[PDB]
Write a structure and sequence with these properties.
7% of the residues lie in helices and 31% in strands. By secondary structure, it is mainly beta. It has a single domain, classed as Beta Complex (Metal Binding Protein, Guanine Nucleotide Exchange Factor, Chain A). The strands form 3 sheets. Strands 5-6-7-8 form a 4-stranded antiparallel β-sheet. The termini are far apart. This is Antiviral innate immune response receptor RIG-I. It is found in: Cytoplasm; Cell projection, Ruffle membrane; Cytoplasm, Cytoskeleton; Cell junction, Tight junction.
Length: 134
């Protein structure tokens, strides 16, 4: 039903991201903001709706941060986990890896999937709480 249409853009110098899973939009670099290059998170319900979070009777795990819930893709695939739900002194947001999704430019369409975070192509940006709420 004429669904093959172009998508809008957030701001200048913006790139789109896909999920290596089924190579489907995951988020946008324009929304992908790192907390002082410590963790990778996105803003907007766009990424909060693209994914999902489940409770489950689980205690906790010993690692950098503390996860009190799991997170998965909202897509049809249920056996496709991206990361988990963690909390930071700053705010409660999920933290994923760099080798979790690909980066497809909207001005090129070239999608790529890194391995290490050291292979970052972004910069440190402060997590605006204004984006969190309405």
């Amino acid at each position: 039903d004429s669904q093959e249409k172009p998508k809008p853009v957030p701001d200048k110098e913006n790139k789109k991201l896909l999920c290596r899973k089924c190579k489907a939009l995951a988020c946008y670099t324009a929304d992908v903001r790192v907390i002082e290059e410590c963790h990778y998170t996105v803003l907007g319900d766009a990424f909060k709706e693209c994914f999902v979070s489940r409770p489950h009777p689980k205690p906790k795990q010993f690692s950098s941060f503390e996860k009190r819930a799991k997170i998965f893709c909202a897509r049809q695939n249920c056996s496709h986990d991206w990361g988990i739900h963690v909390k930071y002194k700053t705010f409660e947001i999920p933290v994923i890896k760099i080798e979790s999704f690909v980066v497809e430019d909207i001005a090129t369409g070239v999608q790529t999937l890194y391995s290490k975070w050291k292979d970052f192509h972004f910069e440190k940006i402060p997590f605006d709480p204004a984006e969190m709420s309405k």
